[PDB]
Write a protein that binds this ligand. Structure first.
Ligand SMILES: *C[C@H]1C[C@@H](C(=O)O)C[C@@H](O)[C@@H]1O
Ligand SMILES: *C[C@H]1C[C@@H](C(=O)O)C[C@@H](O)[C@@H]1O
Lengths: 252, 252
């Protein structure tokens, strides 16, 4: 295992780390959300950049990143543009997606970026190497909002992310049955037992999958997402309730 | 599904029911424990009769049952002699085991008895029919403190309990790996999806199995055990923490 340490938070040891997602449509709402979020308790702040409407302007995006960093100078900050293709709010070109992520890297304002695996291998690898050259970590990600692949497919997908240089592979899948939730846990455990080179983040979405957001410590998900007021994906529970459960499991 | 209702508690619907176990070595300690336990919040009281030292006297056992019922007139009360063979505190003959359970049935003091499947089919069936003739329900049980059978074996074991007339089949197994915890959840889900005639109670014991004590609602365990001060089996957590988690999952 190679853990990832950002600002004295160690990802891949101990209790799963709690991530919350800031969603602001405009600069004023980003400000208001940042000031509210700093009164919540969590480990990592994700900025969901795809919720921001003025996406075409790299400088508008950077101004908003600074509002967030100014509000929370000491928080681990993860910059995430989630494509509509993978369940996010809007669509941009691949070149603009890469430009935004590289601008985030260059700014020094963010600790981590999210890179979607299915952007394409060559672009992903080049952007991972750019991030690493500038001391930014990569959460490499994949989301299936329709269905759950087999455990074997999910393991191979997470292993491919590792091979492309991901610091933290991540997969979120949609259960169509309770059995699909167990499939996601099975894949998570296989990574823990047999492919334990990088911390991985896994989740089964929606109501049936909520147990997967709670059981990260035993089966090997390094982080989990909670909701401050609105979920950033189906199945997230209130962040304080998430924290309560994680502590009970850590101390059991 | 045929649910089991005891004193306005419905087992096999809604949130898993919380069971705690009263362990007293003698009549004075049974008294003290009953008075403490009635200041805890839970759904079913199990009296672990095998912890009681004066086991040879049916009348001493009945006196202790009455102390408990007097302290808690409205609680669902489950009478359980757990054999040392199945992880309990002492050994008695099969005939004395049956005598104690029948005396409990006859007393009107208890709502449910525990009957261990591996006592033997004919004795178990006869005692189930005696319980049913006297309006007492049967939790039919099996415990493996060493290892976890396959999911297929556990399903067939729980189905056999159903066939012998169990109102609530129950299995507790010891994981030797994290994979074994998933095996127990898999068997539980198979009962929910394909053999949903009776409520079943399932648990993977010890620290690795604790998630199985929390995830009953999603995968189909009808009840779960918590600890008031001391666990009655490995892996039980503090009852208030158990209750907190169950409510979070019920409301997620
Ligand atoms: C990494 C994904 C995970 C989503 C989830 O399923 O909780 C939340 C979303 O904001 C993140 O980008
Ligand atoms: C039915 C068993 C279950 C045990 C457990 O694993 O929690 C506790 C014990 O007192 C019960 O009789």
């Amino acid at each position: 295992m190679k853990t990832v340490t950002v600002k004295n938070l160690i990802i891949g040891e101990g209790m799963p780390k709690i991530i919350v997602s800031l969603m602001g449509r405009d600069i004023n709402s980003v400000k208001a959300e940042a000031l509210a979020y700093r009164e919540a308790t969590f480990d990592i702040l994700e900025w969901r950049v795809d919720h921001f409407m003025d996406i075409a302007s790299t400088q508008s995006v950077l101004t908003a990143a600074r509002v967030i960093r100014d509000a929370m100078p000491d928080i681990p900050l993860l910059f995430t543009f989630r494509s509509a293709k993978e369940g996010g709010e809007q669509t941009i070109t691949t070149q603009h997606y890469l430009t935004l992520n590289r601008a985030a890297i260059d700014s020094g304002l963010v600790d981590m970026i999210d890179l979607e695996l299915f952007t394409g291998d060559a672009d992903v690898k080049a952007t991972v190497d750019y991030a690493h050259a500038h001391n930014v970590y990569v959460v490499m990600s994949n989301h299936d909002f329709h269905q759950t692949p087999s455990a074997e497919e999910m393991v191979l997908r997470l292993r491919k992310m590792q091979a492309l240089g991901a610091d933290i592979p991540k997969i979120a899948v949609m259960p169509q049955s309770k059995h699909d939730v167990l499939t996601l846990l099975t894949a998570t455990l296989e990574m823990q037992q047999h492919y334990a080179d990088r911390p991985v983040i896994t989740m089964s979405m929606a109501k049936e999958g909520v147990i997967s957001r709670l059981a990260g410590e035993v089966f090997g998900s390094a982080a989990t997402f909670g909701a401050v007021k609105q979920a950033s994906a189906p199945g997230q529970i209130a962040v304080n309730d998430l924290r309560s459960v994680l502590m009970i499991l850590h101390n059991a």
